[PDB]
Design a protein around this ligand. Structure first.
Ligand SMILES: NC(=O)c1ccc[n+]([C@@H]2O[C@H](COP(=O)([O-])OP(=O)(O)OC[C@H]3O[C@@H](n4cnc5c(N)ncnc54)[C@H](OP(=O)(O)O)[C@@H]3O)[C@@H](O)[C@H]2O)c1
Ligand SMILES: COc1ccc(/C=C2\SC(=O)N(CC(=O)O)C2=O)cc1OCC(=O)O
Length: 325
């Protein structure tokens, strides 16, 4: 293991650096997984919705397990339950499909991808006549209880939440027999999540930062919005430390003890992204980076409806991002 860890409340050690796999396509992801594991990654972040678990599974079967290059117990694998699978009856089949594709016997962590549900079925984006999303009203508290049964079946070691707000977290905690262990949200110097991180610390949830590098090749970017990797302060620190802008972004987080899952398919970047535990920022440098916070969220679900590109879910009563945190 190249990265250091944090201790989850379950007793699990979670490496502070994991490999993100969103947009890592079938035909490239297998190579990315194998390279990452070889250079010391022991944490992979996956999701059914990314459309690549089948291929990730082939890589893990080659590389991980008895008689292979990496012992299964040394590997931390996260997946996520997609929006169409919030019904208590659909939770186990969804997980078992993910286990099958990944060719694993268990996950180390399984997250509820969003608090709100989509219509049950085999369309991951079910749509109305008008082309807007068709929702299902299963409450996330009922989904949570069904996720708990999976821990009892030995299928998942830990559970957590993705894109939940502080109120929704507290709502889950009021009924949780198995406590969420991790919250995964967008986090980087433009969206520091300071209040939500503090909230999680108080309740025993470790935080994972998704899009820790500003997701710079995300679809339909605003040309007027800044590029986090081009941030002058970041470029300045990169110079000073003889490191890449990406390493500065990741160091800032792991110095805060925030787990980061940067995605890359480029072997050199994969390697450099885990090499963030051999330098330290001064208190003044941390302060420079903390000053960049500006409530700039890059990852907002979007849709094409009637010729215009619109927020997918922003109007939903259960949308997480409306509260202050
Ligand atoms: N829970 C959720 O709703 C959710 C949502 C979004 C993301 N996530 C997770 O978080 C992971 C990471 O977030 P993300 O994929 O949105 O974006 P990201 O990790 O912030 O950035 C990925 C982009 O940065 C590039 N990159 C990687 N390393 C670099 C480096 N060292 N220097 C310069 N560029 C570099 C990648 O290019 P190359 O790959 O071409 O090298 C890719 O274009 C995802 O893969 C996914 O696992 C979860
Ligand atoms: C593969 O399915 C997905 C499709 C779209 C998204 C969300 C996106 S994609 C994208 O370019 N952006 C940014 C934006 O719309 O400004 C988003 O907010 C997220 C998806 O997966 C959920 C995830 O990233 O974990």
């Amino acid at each position: 293991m190249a990265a250091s860890c944090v201790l989850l409340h379950t007793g699990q050690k979670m490496p502070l650096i994991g490999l993100g796999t969103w947009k890592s396509e079938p035909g490239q992801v297998k190579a990315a997984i194998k390279y990452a594991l070889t250079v010391g990654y022991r944490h992979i972040d996956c999701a059914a919705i990314y459309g690549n678990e089948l291929e990730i599974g082939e890589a893990l079967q080659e590389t991980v397990g008895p008689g292979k290059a990496v012992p299964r117990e040394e590997l931390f694998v996260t997946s996520k339950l997609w929006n169409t699978k919030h019904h208590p009856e659909d939770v186990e089949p969804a997980l078992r499909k993910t286990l099958a594709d990944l060719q694993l016997e268990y996950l180390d962590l399984y997250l509820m991808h969003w608090p709100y549900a989509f219509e049950r079925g085999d369309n991951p984006f079910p749509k109305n006549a008008d082309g807007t999303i068709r929702y299902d009203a299963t409450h996330y508290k009922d989904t949570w209880k069904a996720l708990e049964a999976l821990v009892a079946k030995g299928l998942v070691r830990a559970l957590g939440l993705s894109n939940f707000s502080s109120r929704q977290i507290d709502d889950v905690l009021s009924v949780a027999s198995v406590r969420p262990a991790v919250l995964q949200v967008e986090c980087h110097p433009y969206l520091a999540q300071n209040e939500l991180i503090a909230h999680c610390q108080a309740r025993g949830l470790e935080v994972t930062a998704y899009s820790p590098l500003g997701s710079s090749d995300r679809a339909w970017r605003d040309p007027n919005e800044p590029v986090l990797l081009e941030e002058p302060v970041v470029q300045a620190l990169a110079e000073k430390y003889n490191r890449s802008p990406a390493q500065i972004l990741l160091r800032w987080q792991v110095q805060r003890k925030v787990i980061c899952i940067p995605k890359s398919v480029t072997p050199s970047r994969i390697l450099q992204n885990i090499q963030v535990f051999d330098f330290t920022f001064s208190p003044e440098e941390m302060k420079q980076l903390d000053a960049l916070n500006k409530n700039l969220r890059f990852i907002v679900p979007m849709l094409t409806v009637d010729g215009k590109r619109v927020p997918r879910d922003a109007g939903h009563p259960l949308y997480p991002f409306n509260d202050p945190y």
